[PDB]
Coordinates of all heavy atoms in Angstrom, one line a residue:
Chain D
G298 N -32.7 26.2 49.9 CA -33.7 25.1 49.8 C -35.1 25.6 49.6 O -36.0 24.8 49.5
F299 N -35.3 26.9 49.5 CA -36.7 27.5 49.4 C -37.2 27.3 47.9 O -36.4 27.4 47.0 CB -36.7 29.0 49.7 CG -38.0 29.5 50.0 CD1 -38.6 29.1 51.3 CD2 -38.7 30.3 49.2 CE1 -39.8 29.6 51.7 CE2 -40.0 30.8 49.6 CZ -40.5 30.4 50.8
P300 N -38.4 26.8 47.8 CA -38.9 26.6 46.4 C -39.1 27.8 45.6 O -39.3 28.9 46.2 CB -40.3 25.8 46.6 CG -40.7 26.3 48.0 CD -39.5 26.6 48.8
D301 N -39.1 27.7 44.3 CA -39.1 28.8 43.4 C -40.4 28.9 42.5 O -40.4 29.3 41.4 CB -37.9 28.8 42.5 CG -37.8 27.6 41.5 OD1 -38.0 26.5 41.9 OD2 -37.6 27.9 40.3
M302 N -41.5 28.4 43.1 CA -42.8 28.5 42.5 C -43.7 29.5 43.3 O -43.4 29.8 44.5 CB -43.5 27.2 42.4 CG -42.6 26.0 42.2 SD -43.6 24.4 42.0 CE -43.2 23.6 43.5
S303 N -44.8 29.9 42.8 CA -45.6 30.9 43.4 C -46.6 30.3 44.3 O -46.8 29.1 44.3 CB -46.4 31.8 42.3 OG -45.5 32.0 41.2
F304 N -47.3 31.2 45.1 CA -48.3 30.7 46.0 C -49.6 30.5 45.4 O -49.9 31.1 44.4 CB -48.5 31.7 47.2 CG -48.7 31.1 48.5 CD1 -47.7 30.3 49.1 CD2 -49.9 31.4 49.2 CE1 -48.0 29.7 50.3 CE2 -50.1 30.8 50.5 CZ -49.1 30.0 51.0
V305 N -50.4 29.6 45.9 CA -51.8 29.3 45.4 C -52.7 29.8 46.4 O -52.7 29.4 47.6 CB -52.0 27.8 45.0 CG1 -51.3 26.9 46.1 CG2 -53.4 27.5 44.9
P306 N -53.6 30.8 46.1 CA -54.5 31.4 47.1 C -55.7 30.4 47.4 O -56.6 30.3 46.6 CB -55.0 32.7 46.4 CG -54.7 32.5 44.9 CD -53.9 31.2 44.7
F307 N -55.7 29.8 48.6 CA -56.7 29.0 49.0 C -57.2 29.3 50.4 O -56.4 30.0 51.1 CB -56.3 27.5 49.0 CG -55.4 27.1 50.1 CD1 -55.9 26.3 51.1 CD2 -54.1 27.5 50.2 CE1 -55.2 25.9 52.2 CE2 -53.3 27.1 51.2 CZ -53.8 26.3 52.3
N308 N -58.4 28.9 50.8 CA -58.8 29.2 52.2 C -59.7 28.1 52.6 O -60.3 27.3 51.7 CB -59.5 30.5 52.3 CG -59.3 31.2 53.6 OD1 -58.6 30.7 54.5 ND2 -59.9 32.4 53.7
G309 N -59.9 27.9 53.9 CA -60.8 26.8 54.4 C -60.1 25.5 54.5 O -58.9 25.4 54.4
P310 N -60.9 24.4 54.7 CA -60.3 23.1 54.9 C -59.9 22.3 53.6 O -59.7 21.1 53.6 CB -61.3 22.3 55.7 CG -62.6 23.0 55.2 CD -62.3 24.4 54.7
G311 N -59.9 23.0 52.4 CA -59.6 22.3 51.2 C -58.2 22.4 50.9 O -57.5 23.4 51.0
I312 N -57.6 21.2 50.5 CA -56.2 21.1 50.1 C -56.0 21.8 48.8 O -56.7 21.4 47.8 CB -55.8 19.7 50.1 CG1 -56.3 18.9 51.4 CG2 -54.3 19.5 50.0 CD1 -56.4 17.4 51.2
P313 N -55.1 22.7 48.7 CA -54.9 23.5 47.4 C -54.2 22.6 46.4 O -53.4 21.7 46.6 CB -54.0 24.7 47.8 CG -53.2 24.2 49.0 CD -54.2 23.3 49.8
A314 N -54.6 22.9 45.1 CA -54.0 22.2 44.0 C -52.5 22.6 43.8 O -52.2 23.8 43.9 CB -54.8 22.4 42.7
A315 N -51.7 21.6 43.4 CA -50.2 21.8 43.2 C -49.5 22.5 44.3 O -49.9 22.4 45.5 CB -50.0 22.6 41.8
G316 N -48.4 23.0 44.0 CA -47.6 23.8 45.0 C -46.5 22.9 45.6 O -46.2 21.8 45.2
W317 N -45.8 23.5 46.6 CA -44.7 22.9 47.3 C -45.1 22.6 48.8 O -45.2 23.6 49.5 CB -43.5 23.7 47.2 CG -42.2 22.9 47.4 CD1 -41.4 22.5 46.4 CD2 -41.5 22.5 48.6 NE1 -40.3 21.8 46.9 CE2 -40.4 21.8 48.2 CE3 -41.8 22.6 49.9 CZ2 -39.5 21.3 49.1 CZ3 -41.0 22.1 50.9 CH2 -39.8 21.4 50.5
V318 N -45.3 21.4 49.2 CA -45.6 21.1 50.6 C -44.5 20.2 51.1 O -43.9 19.4 50.4 CB -47.0 20.4 50.8 CG1 -48.1 21.3 50.4 CG2 -47.1 19.1 49.9
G319 N -44.1 20.5 52.4 CA -42.9 19.8 53.0 C -43.2 19.6 54.5 O -43.9 20.4 55.1
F320 N -42.6 18.6 55.0 CA -42.7 18.3 56.4 C -41.7 19.0 57.2 O -40.6 18.9 57.1 CB -42.5 16.8 56.6 CG -43.7 15.9 56.2 CD1 -43.6 14.6 55.9 CD2 -45.0 16.5 56.0 CE1 -44.6 13.8 55.5 CE2 -46.1 15.7 55.6 CZ -45.9 14.4 55.4
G321 N -42.2 19.9 58.1 CA -41.4 20.8 58.9 C -42.1 21.3 60.2 O -43.2 20.9 60.4
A322 N -41.4 22.2 60.8 CA -41.9 22.8 62.1 C -41.4 24.2 62.2 O -40.7 24.7 61.4 CB -41.5 21.9 63.2
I323 N -41.8 24.8 63.3 CA -41.4 26.2 63.7 C -40.5 26.0 64.9 O -40.4 25.0 65.5 CB -42.6 27.1 64.1 CG1 -42.4 28.5 63.7 CG2 -43.1 26.9 65.5 CD1 -43.6 29.3 63.4
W324 N -39.7 27.1 65.1 CA -38.7 27.1 66.2 C -38.5 28.6 66.6 O -38.3 29.4 65.7 CB -37.4 26.4 65.8 CG -36.6 27.0 64.7 CD1 -37.0 27.2 63.5 CD2 -35.3 27.6 64.9 NE1 -36.0 27.8 62.7 CE2 -34.9 28.0 63.6 CE3 -34.4 27.7 65.9 CZ2 -33.7 28.7 63.4 CZ3 -33.2 28.4 65.7 CH2 -32.8 28.8 64.4
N325 N -38.4 28.8 67.9 CA -38.1 30.1 68.4 C -36.7 30.4 68.4 O -35.8 29.6 68.1 CB -38.6 30.2 69.9 CG -37.7 29.5 70.9 OD1 -37.3 28.4 70.6 ND2 -37.4 30.1 72.0

Side-chain angles (χ1 to χ4, degrees):
Chain D
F299 202 69
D301 67 310
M302 332 181 252
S303 319
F304 218 59
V305 41
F307 79 107
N308 217 358
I312 312 156
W317 205 98
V318 296
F320 284 160
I323 211 154
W324 65 295
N325 74 318

